[PDB]
Amino acid sequence: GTELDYDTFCFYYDWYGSEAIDGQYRHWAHAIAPDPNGGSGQNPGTIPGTQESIASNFYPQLGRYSSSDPNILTKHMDMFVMARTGVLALTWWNEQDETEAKRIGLILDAADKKKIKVCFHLEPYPSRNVQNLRENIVKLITRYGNHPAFYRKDGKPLFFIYDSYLIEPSEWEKLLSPGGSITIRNTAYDALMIGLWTSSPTVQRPFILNAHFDGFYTYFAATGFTYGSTPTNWVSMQKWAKENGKIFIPSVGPGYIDTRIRPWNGSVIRTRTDGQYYDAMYRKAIEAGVSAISITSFNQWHEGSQIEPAVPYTSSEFTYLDYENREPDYYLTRTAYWVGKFRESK
Numbered sequence: 001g002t003e004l005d006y007d008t009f010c011f012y013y014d015w016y017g018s019e020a021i022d023g024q025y026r027h028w029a030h031a032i033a034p035d036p037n038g039g040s041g042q043n044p045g046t047i048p049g050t051q052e053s054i055a056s057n058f059y060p061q062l063g064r065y066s067s068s069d070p071n072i073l074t075k076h077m078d079m080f081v082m083a084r085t086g087v088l089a090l091t092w093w094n095e096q097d098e099t100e101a102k103r104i105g106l107i108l109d110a111a112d113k114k115k116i117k118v119c120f121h122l123e124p125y126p127s128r129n130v131q132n133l134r135e136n137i138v139k140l141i142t143r144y145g146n147h148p149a150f151y152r153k154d155g156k157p158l159f160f161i162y163d164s165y166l167i168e169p170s171e172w173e174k175l176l177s178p179g180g181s182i183t184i185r186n187t188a189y190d191a192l193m194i195g196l197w198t199s200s201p202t203v204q205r206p207f208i209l210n211a212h213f214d215g216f217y218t219y220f221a222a223t224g225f226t227y228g229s230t231p232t233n234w235v236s237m238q239k240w241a242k243e244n245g246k247i248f249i250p251s252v253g254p255g256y257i258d259t260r261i262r263p264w265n266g267s268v269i270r271t272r273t274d275g276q277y278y279d280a281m282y283r284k285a286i287e288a289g290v291s292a293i294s295i296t297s298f299n300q301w302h303e304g305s306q307i308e309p310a311v312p313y314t315s316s317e318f319t320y321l322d323y324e325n326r327e328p329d330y331y332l333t334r335t336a337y338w339v340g341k342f343r344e345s346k
């Protein structure tokens with residue numbers, strides 16, 4: 001009851017910087033988003049990423065850390081071990097820069113020391129399309145496929161494709177149908193491709209089938225934000241997946257709040273209630289009978305979905321939220337509890 005689960009995927013963000021490593025507190029400093037339904041000439045400003053004012057409603061136990069600090073990465077991997085989460089699902093933005101390449105290598109190396117695996121979460125990078133996706137899948141498999149920490153399920157890499165609906169099924173078919181013009185099927189670069197189920201079944205069922213995804217996930221930590229992130233739909237989504245040979249990987253999270261960076265987005269807040277929100281969502285995933293679960297998130301601090309330890313903090317600029325009345329590592333240990341319950345059902 002302590003071993004890592006390799007059907008549990010925790011969404012991980014590698015975009016943080018520190019003075020120690022990067023020379024800048026990247027992402028801890030963040031622009032504030034204008035209200036999309038507000039007026040013109042909004043000047044919302046920026047969170048400066050100082051000790052006192054960071055781009056989160058919570059405050060990390062590890063402080064304003066760098067994602068490129070090997071000592072932080074060690075600690076993160078120990079946290080994954082505590083949580084029993086065997087797969088780190090790494091955000092990937094196609095930055096095409098030496099710092100990205102360095103960081104990915106460091107993350108893989110750190111993960112392997114703890115027998116954690118790494119897969120990629122392919123984000124909506126500029127001009128993303130099925131041809132450059134193929135090229136990037138080839139690149140990532142070529143670069144990292146022989147690293148011992150690179151994840152495979154029954155011999156195949158796995159990719160989560162965020163906002164897959166931004167690409168038409170007629171394009172996806174070219175990449176993902178066995179007869180597709182630029183198919184990866186039956187090639188050295190074949191992979192499990194997990195698309196994002198957002199809206200109602202009348203839209204999503206034909207999308208997933210016609211695009212030839214291997215499965216689907218839901219991402220959002222906030223219950224009811226989409227049809228897919230409404231857990232009362234999960235039993236029927238799983239039934240459909242099973243009938244159609246698809247892998248359903250529902251996403252569970254401990255809460256949501258992003259109002260430091262999106263002050264206008266308060267309707268999406270989901271309160272943690274000392275763990276009860278996380279418990280309800282994880283229980284529903286398990287009860288749906290799925291074979292894999294994803295966790296939003298390890299460390300999306302901007303969106304308040306993180307399970308990474310947070311500490312009480314009041315500064316002159318902001319009174320942060322915290323996990324009280326639970327301890328800083330509560331969400332790691334509660335994840336381990338749920339991983340056990342999930343395994344009991346597998």
Ligand SMILES: CO[C@H]1O[C@H](CO)[C@@H](O)[C@H](O)[C@@H]1O[C@H]1O[C@H](CO)[C@@H](O)[C@H](O)[C@@H]1O[C@H]1O[C@H](CO)[C@@H](O)[C@H](O[C@H]2O[C@H](CO)[C@@H](O)[C@H](O)[C@@H]2O)[C@@H]1O
Nearest residue numbers: 091123124162163198220221225226258261268300302303
């Ligand atoms: C209305 O758009 C949201 O909801 C749609 C579904 O109805 C999604 O398809 C769409 O992508 C939008 O969801 C993202 O944005 C909202 C805010 O509008 C967040 O609440 C969501 O959680 C989601 O964004 C997060 O997850 C994405 C996957 O990892 C990631 O791409 C996002 O990154 C963006 O926001 C962060 C700030 O939190 C910013 O630093 C990044 O540069 C990027 O702009 C985010 O993690």
